[PDB]
Symmetry: D2
């Protein structure tokens, strides 16, 4: 009746008039350019998996309308069993990219999956949500989350650097402005414009809507591409992760883009723009998605580290095994947070369920200390062994250097130099490369800075009265005694021997 996109169909959808810029040049074909080519084929694997009959039970589910099937995470869960199956689907796609591609098409489904039960929240534009929910289910659409405001000067009415309406036509809304760190945007179908907060509180800034990536006026200015650089100066062997998994955090610029009314979710309502960051249900599911994925990535890094320690022979050392288990401990933590999130949900709109908020609010903090610790352990237990490597694959083919490398760069496993160098460069690409550096910064500030993640945690529990409960808990301990002694009947104060002991040092 109705199927989602295939790998090729997704690729064809990117071959439009989108205006992507990189290294001063405009990218003619996004699916052909080295910066996006292999990443696009990687995303195509996700779409192709939806059509594999051996994976349909895990990955797919009916599309509410029932005319077809869709990616499971694009549908609202109505039971714990659904959320457990949601977890498997997320972990499935995560493994296909080895846990590195955070902005896979299923991530933004953390928002899209709630447009069905939470449509009325977007009044008067509630019907727009009702259709985009239907369609994003129908095609399994790829949206990017553009919400971060660009840096602004403080010197005068020039607040127009923000996304803003310049004109209200009958067709829709003429919009100019920009958003930063629009990760993966160049390979998406549409940019979802939102805000973490309005600096100027006027109607023209209060806009939440989706815009097609080929919209006239919309331009994409890329950050330096680690995948493109790996194509020209590196190799699949020397740069296994960066060359095919790099998600470009590009600048998204709108120049008088016409946003149709059918694409608007919120407009003018500064409250709903504010309430979106906590009542949309995205953050509960986004943390649910990210935690499950991070758990998968840790398995990959743990396996990488384990193979590395076997090759260097450091696996035999006791201290090294402690830190390896430490990496495994963090792996179990995020699997447990994901388990708690999926299996201990909270009731939401129209009989649907959101993953455990308290499991999600904790993930935002421990990711900022856990992931760097993992990267630190690698730098500590492998150390300079990561630098025991050659320039490129040409060094092994060159008769002048090849034999030397195989003689002096062997592993302890009985492994060859090729195997050792292969793991070391793979590990380094995950830890010390431009790609690894970006991902460390990524997993550290992915949801917010290290202060706000904890503060928003305090505020959330204060508002929910949980903080009041903790203080009442402590107060219950204090109510059981006073300056005279215990107030609880079943406890003895030992007034006699206490005063007797006090008198033992009397007159001194």
């Amino acid at each position: 009746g109705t199927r989602p996109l295939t790998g090729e169909e997704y690729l064809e959808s990117l071959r439009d008039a989108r205006e992507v810029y990189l290294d001063g040049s405009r990218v003619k074909d996004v699916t052909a350019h080295p910066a996006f080519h292999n990443p696009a084929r990687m995303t195509a694997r996700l779409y192709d998996s939806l059509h594999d009959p051996a994976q349909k039970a895990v990955l797919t589910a009916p599309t509410d309308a029932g005319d077809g099937f869709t990616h499971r995470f694009f549908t609202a869960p109505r039971s714990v069993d659904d959320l457990v199956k949601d977890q498997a689907a997320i972990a499935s796609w995560a493994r296909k990219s080895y846990g590195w591609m955070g902005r896979s098409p299923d991530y933004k489904a953390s928002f899209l999956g709630t447009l069905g039960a939470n449509a009325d929240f977007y009044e008067p534009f509630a019907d727009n949500a009702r259709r985009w929910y239907r369609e994003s289910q129908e095609k399994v659409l790829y949206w990017n989350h553009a919400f971060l405001h660009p840096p602004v000067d403080r010197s005068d009415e020039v607040g127009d650097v923000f996304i803003h309406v310049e004109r209200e036509t009958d067709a829709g809304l003429v919009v100019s402005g920009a958003k930063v760190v629009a990760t993966g945007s160049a390979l998406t179908h549409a940019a979802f414009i939102s805000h973490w907060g309005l600096p100027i509180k006027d109607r023209k800034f209060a806009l939440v809507a989706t815009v097609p990536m080929d919209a006239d006026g919309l331009k994409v200015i890329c950050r330096p591409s680690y995948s493109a650089n790996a194509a020209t100066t590196g190799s699949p062997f020397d740069n296994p992760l960066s060359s095919r998994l790099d998600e470009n955090d590009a600048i998204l610029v709108l120049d008088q883009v016409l946003i149709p009314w059918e694409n608007v979710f919120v407009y003018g309502n500064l409250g709903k723009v504010h309430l979106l960051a906590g009542q949309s249900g995205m953050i509960e599911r986004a943390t649910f998605h990210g935690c499950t994925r991070l758990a998968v990535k840790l398995e990959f890094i743990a396996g990488l580290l384990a193979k590395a320690l076997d090759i260097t022979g450091a696996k035999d050392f006791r201290g090294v095994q402690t830190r390896l288990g430490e990496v495994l401990a963090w792996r179990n933590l995020f699997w447990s947070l994901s388990d708690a999130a999926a299996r201990n949900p909270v009731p939401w709109k129209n009989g649907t369920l959101l993953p455990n908020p308290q499991a999600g609010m904790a993930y935002r903090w421990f990711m900022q200390i856990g992931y760097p610790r993992v990267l630190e352990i690698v730098q500590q237990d492998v150390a300079s062994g990561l630098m025991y490597v050659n320039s490129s694959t040409e060094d092994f083919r060159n008769p002048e250097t090849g034999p030397y490398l195989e003689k002096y760069l062997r592993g302890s496993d009985g492994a060859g130099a090729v195997e050792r160098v292969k793991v070391m460069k793979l590990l380094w690409d995950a830890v010390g490369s431009d790609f690894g550096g970006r991902h460390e910064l990524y997993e550290r500030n992915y949801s917010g800075n290290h202060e706000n993640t904890r503060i928003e945690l305090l505020l959330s529990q204060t508002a929910s009265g949980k903080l009041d409960s903790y203080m009442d808990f402590a107060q219950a301990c204090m109510d059981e005694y006073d300056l005279d002694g215990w107030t609880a009947p079943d406890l003895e104060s030992f007034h006699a021997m206490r005063s007797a002991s006090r008198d033992l040092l009397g007159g001194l």
Copy 2:
């Protein structure tokens, strides 16, 4: 057939147990200041078992069905049961505000599975079946004495009589032992591989030959030199980590669980199922304790007025983050269990093995934040309660020790001393040391997780995961058909640096 009551439990301790403290033998354990109030606190747990308003949370039938019992003493057979297990554990944890770790329900992590795991203890399988029945019926209080003292130093058999087994040796850090009904003698690992050391059994605390040498009592010191106000936690919640010494104790055959079988003694620390439930219990309890400390810290910061500052609020939320962590680990443990013996379920091992590590870094961090955000405000206190009654000092304290909250000096000193007793006292120090090494030293906890994942092939799975990535390319480029290697522009760029 109801379990023991609070008063009945107290009477059960008034036996011929040989407890020593400060060079003297303790005549009445339930009367001595070192154990009096802690025993009364333990009595509260037993009394809660009989409250009709708490029966739904705390209780369940006794397998035989002739009565009821504490829920954790029964083997879980569903996820719903394990969620209720969590509620029961959290309930008793709150009654002691999360400080009494070796409560009677903790050792039930072992006792609650002796029914479904009886045949593992052959030929003494019937011994497990009775101790399971009885521990259900009365809710018995056992202490886990397993830590070896630094050949005759180990628990060992000296003689095999027809009546039972003559045993000498010792155990250290027998926490709460003096107020328990029986010591469960076990081992984590055998230093000497001999039959006489391969012994797992329970011994009554009033058994002739068994002696208890106490650690310094923080509750006794608080009774004679302190007060319930100046020492709110230590004076009534102190669990003495005493030395447990056996001198030719006769262990009846009906009390032996494992003997001679060198395999089952070694295998016990991983096949008994205790470790999955003990971590489940401890994690649930620690989550409760963190709530208590969080509420304490919040009151402290509110009184000092430091709650308004942004930096302080970040670290307060950090404490709440750790609180959510152990609740999530407990949630994951209870709601994602693994199948076990006789249709029963063990809590998630993967959640419990993580708990043993993050507790060693999390709990000290919480105590550290208190020392950082309250700082010298913990020392803004007077010697004792008599200072408030003394006309010479009383009014002065009331003037100079008020809080920013608009609070009085009495309230401020009350919070500070409660917080300090939780963080910096001998009681706080012991508990810092406890929560750090309660399950093992900071090295073994991580290694045993690695060993557990290595044996299960999970570690092998991770390496296969990484290997799958390497199989998609080689020295030539990608081996996957759908990927481009860009050999042309790569070699073209190499030519830019030719000669």
Copy 3:
């Protein structure tokens, strides 16, 4: 002349001082268990000043030249002096094993500079010049009472030190100070302020008050030494029973402060500058850094003995963390070395210890010392609980033989030795005494935020931060959007553009 002896110092405490503890007034401070043994320890310090074998390290002339005094009570005029100052401080630190931080030589960080920095205290500059003289002659024991008591702010500020009346005889002052550590065993409390807090003439007061002054009261915190006397023993509580410094509340009730005791009054400006211009903070960090280095040696030796007994010393992982403690030990000796040997010029040819070395100490002590205590709790672990209640258990025939059988060390040590070190180590780490010292060394100079903030402010005001930014700016000046601006560097434009062309038509 000469400073006080051990007996003379003890006799000086037997005055009309009003010390309170457990609701009762202490009749004789030198006799009460709370202060008895700690006072005898301080007496050791005074007695060391008269030992001919220690005169070269500890002593120096007294400016007037009519006698001698403790070396740190004189202003250093050379690097050699500051090195000898370090030796004097380290000497007294070892006598208390680095625990009694508020020893009489600590307050000399302020007192030792009243000579060269007397005119800063005008018009009361002459009061400073003789109190400099007098505190030098006897080696007076002053406590630094500067921390303001908690206030409600909901609206009178009578909790702060303030003048209630100005007589011709002196100044009538009421108020309080908190965490007056060691005050009960001191000769006089030196009242100062870090906070303003309110812009009023009458709160701007810096002066000294005798500890036996009528109206002055001392309200003690729970005494760890007194409790160890009644429920413990020197064996079971070796540090707390004799080294406990009571952080008491210091209360003034209409105390008449003579004009001869005033250092600063009314001058609201100098009170603010007092923290940065008294010179004390440079020397106080110098004193504390040297002492902490001494204490770490004590803990390191303690830990090593414990690990040898538990047998954990043979393990590689344990040795790494043992070496980690030694690393911190070397750190504070190096900070002290940099402080003593790289000083800064000050008033009248005198020198202050290196400020940059001392200000770093205020931060790394907050992370270093807890780490040391943590390693002990990790590598000794539950072995600290492998102990008996008290010494009576060894004497009891019913328990004695058992302890000696089951509580032996792996080194071949007896139970007595094992319990001895284990109780000594615990008293240093996990007891009320150990907890208080962790909290102390953590907040010794200020909370963990201000120590870093005051560091930023100090380098910003000195233009040092400006220097760092100019350094980075010098790098940016060597290139721009065109390429390098430096002549000797190549931009490789031809090759770069050629590589850019590799992605043409894509």
Copy 4:
């Protein structure tokens, strides 16, 4: 008089028959290839500074022979004043490379500067040391420290895997035929000669007990490079987009010897298995190398601190209290390594022939606190600047392109009132220092610069155990225990309070 090398002379000295490999090709001219071109020009700046009359007082000193002058650190100090001047000289050259080029020519001078007073230690080859000391002073030679053994398979017998180590294969009349390899030979491709040494002998055979110097143009010696971050920046980056990596990259290359003839005049130690193993602590290098690295790291932290300050000033996060605490934290670490360096220079230890070594314990501490301090500094940047580092464009051409240029200038301005160009300039410089391949390598570098995080602490424990300092600490602790026993105090001046203790015990009697 005699002068050291100039910038041009140093560059010409590299234009020899050195066999350097990179990206499968042999480098024809090292001074011309992008991988080494700009790094060589930066090193050339150091040599040129020696001839600047405005810098001779700080940088230079007589050359023992007195026939000329030389870099001051190549001479042995005889006073505290000398080591303070040494500190200034090291800090001077460190600033010229902004504290990044760790293996500068003066680093290996930590060894060469001691060949004068410690010549007789290398008998019978003492005269070889005396002349290489003489010559290295005269031109300020650039040596690289190759000591790290290449990876070996411990599942094979040592008979098979000892050909991986540097070893003598034959003793000719001319010298010694040597084969083997060394790893992480940082900066080797731009050096004059490789100093072959060992961190102890792994196999105890005469053939491995070899300590000698080999010219970089020696026939048989090959250099296999690690991926060059400067070369990649030349083709895909720019001085604006990659300010540090493109000109400060030190390649940690593999150094391979294939039947290289080492002349007898170049041998320092041979056959003496004792001196080779004992050298790592008796050469005096470790005291000075830690002294050099500590002084340099202090300089680098100032550069990073200034960078962070500008970044926070631009983002406007500098006004926040929490951000200022961590900024001061970076300044705290900055003060730390200056203090460690001060203690090293101003509290030295006596050595051979009236010369002085910097404080060893100040240096032994440096080897540890660098492994926790520097990552913390880099962490603070990722925390306080955060995603603001990704607020950047692909390259400088985006500003030149009329289609994107104006947009960047409008939307990427700073809070400072700064333009977009300046902001992107600072962010890309900061990222190149923190998150780039160059930054990653440098994080790994400062982490294992002296050794892995375990050995650095253990060697400290062993050093203090051997010196009896560890026993001294235990005697300190013992002095406390000697003052009491099971009876009470043993010290006369202390009261045991036997009365009230037993009285209190009786209150809890029966």
